[PDB]
Symmetry: none
């Protein structure tokens, strides 16, 4: 069945964001995650346990140097909200990495009907 025990789980506002940090040093991410969780959960009025953060442990090459990227896999919020989230993530990373570092933030939409928790979709 569905999960009607956990508060506010199926709200449209609860985009269930999974943040994936690529081409970013581990210590930066470790410092970032607590402050990002504080700011995003407030901004989106979403439970703190609705977010997941992943450091991706791969090796990158690009001519001119590799820039950091955060992929956000989520159910979607309207463009204006998405824009604000991108701005929060960028601003926090700039604090640790430079006000002109060139962060990419990319949102990838997941379908609620293709996301299953304990065998039942959203």
């Amino acid at each position: 069945g569905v999960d009607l025990g956990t508060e506010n789980l199926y709200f449209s506002s609860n985009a269930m964001p999974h943040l994936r940090f690529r081409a970013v040093e581990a210590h930066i991410v470790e410092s970032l995650v607590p402050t990002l969780l504080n700011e995003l959960s407030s901004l989106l009025s979403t439970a703190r346990n609705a977010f997941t953060f992943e450091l991706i442990n791969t090796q990158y090459f690009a001519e001119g140097g590799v820039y950091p990227m955060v992929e956000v896999l989520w159910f979607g919020r309207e463009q204006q909200t998405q824009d604000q989230i991108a701005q929060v993530i960028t601003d926090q990373i700039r604090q640790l990495l430079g006000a002109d570092s060139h962060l990419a933030v990319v949102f990838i939409p997941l379908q609620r009907t293709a996301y299953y928790l304990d065998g039942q979709h959203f």
Copy 2:
């Protein structure tokens, strides 16, 4: 007996609205209530103590995500006034939840002859 102590109680313009907030995060409602009271009491020229606000504590499921809803139980005002009220509530919720979030506002009429205060009806 009727209540002829409290000012303006039986005016037709005093619809005695009870607002019920469903599928909305508690922190949002907590923030919304004082500003909504200010705006609605001004708009309707109604005493501030004529409004009640309730956060409903249930769990919701909908395919595609659950959208917030405000139920207004009241004696009724004319269509054009009802429309303005719906627009105020919507605009204030958008400021906290997003300018493209999808709020439902539903008005439910109560009969004055079925509403008793201290054992006497309106």
